Design a protein around this ligand. Structure first.
Ligand SMILES: *[C@@H]1O[C@H](CO)[C@@H](O)[C@H](O)[C@H]1NC(C)=O
Ligand SMILES: *[C@@H]1O[C@H](CO)[C@@H](O)[C@H](O)[C@H]1NC(C)=O
Ligand SMILES: *[C@@H]1O[C@H](CO)[C@@H](O)[C@H](O)[C@H]1NC(C)=O
Length: 291
């Protein structure tokens, strides 16, 4: 002895309550300790709680771990440790947490020109797995009287393809997700755009006394908004005149020449298309090598 004789898996739901029970036989009657596996955190009777949601009751033979206001983060493995002096045994169970679908896309606002294709991505996490639909108003998509809309489904993701856009395609879209816990929705926006968005993540990746290579990320319109070229502006920090270098088409690296050694420069990048020039990236500072 001792021997854990009860430690059931449990399934609960977000915002609900669950009680985990562990029973152990043995002589002497063993002390029971709870361990949350993801972070190795220990629970014992009395040992309070920070957020208050979690308490343990009973210490010998049987112990209850009570969690109120269940969070998704409470999901996973919990360990029960039964120990007497003789005197050791551990067992795991898993807490399965169910919940209404949640929308987890990084982007809900999309931009496109007239006449361009664009995919709008609806990303859903739910337990159990949800059914996802796209809708415009009350109409499920694609409608029967359209020839420019398609959907593509992959478990946690449903893509709405609009190819190409016409003006009436702009506006609000409604992505709905449903499981036995509930139905939830998330609105997405497709807006008619003109100039490119701001480039970002600009870095100096090569650097000498008189030259530097700047590299950046294109603004991702997901193909809605064209980029013709980039304008790279460079300026010595106590100088007034921005020197402009155009990129070779849609290349996202540009080599800067004719720099002074040991000199501090500001650099900013903007994308340009047929409708004009977008915002500049956040200004970055570099300093050429000394002689
Ligand atoms: C508990 O759940 C896990 C999977 O999450 C499973 O492997 C195991 O058989 C289940 N039963 C118990 C009581 O451990
Ligand atoms: C939209 O997604 C589909 C499915 O993966 C893909 O075939 C298509 O090329 C994408 N279109 C756009 C607008 O990028
Ligand atoms: C999205 O669709 C769902 C299900 O039809 C609906 O209940 C919800 O109100 C819609 N959202 C909006 C604002 O249209």
């Amino acid at each position: 002895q001792p021997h854990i004789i009860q430690l059931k898996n449990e399934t609960t739901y977000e915002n609900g309550q669950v009680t985990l029970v562990c029973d152990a036989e043995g002589e002497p009657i063993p002390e029971i300790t709870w361990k949350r596996a993801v972070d190795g955190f220990t629970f014992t009777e009395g040992d309070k709680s920070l957020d208050g949601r979690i308490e343990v009751k009973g210490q010998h033979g049987s112990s209850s771990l009570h969690i109120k206001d269940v969070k998704l983060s409470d999901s996973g493995r919990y360990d029960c440790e039964a120990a007497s002096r003789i005197g050791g045994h551990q067992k795991s169970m898993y807490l399965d947490i169910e919940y209404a679908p949640k929308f987890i896309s990084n982007q809900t606002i999309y931009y496109s020109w007239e006449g361009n294709p664009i995919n709008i991505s609806c990303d859903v996490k739910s337990n159990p797995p949800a059914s996802i639909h796209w809708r415009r108003d009350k109409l499920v998509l694609p409608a029967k009287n359209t020839t420019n809309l398609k959907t593509y489904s992959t478990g946690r993701k449903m893509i709405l393809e609009i190819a190409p856009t016409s003006d009436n395609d702009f506006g609000r879209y409604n992505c709905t997700a449903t499981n036995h816990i509930g139905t939830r929705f998330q609105e997405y926006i497709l807006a008619l755009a003109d100039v490119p968005s701001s480039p970002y993540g600009v870095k100096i990746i090569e650097l000498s006394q008189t030259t530097a290579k700047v590299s950046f990320n294109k603004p991702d319109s997901h193909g809605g908004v064209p980029i013709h070229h980039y304008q790279v502006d460079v300026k010595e920090v106590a100088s007034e005149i921005w020197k402009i270098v155009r990129s070779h088409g849609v290349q996202t690296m540009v080599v800067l020449n004719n720099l002074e050694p040991n000199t501090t420069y500001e650099i900013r990048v903007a994308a340009v298309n047929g409708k004009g020039q977008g915002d500049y990236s956040k200004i970055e500072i570099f300093q050429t090598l000394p002689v």
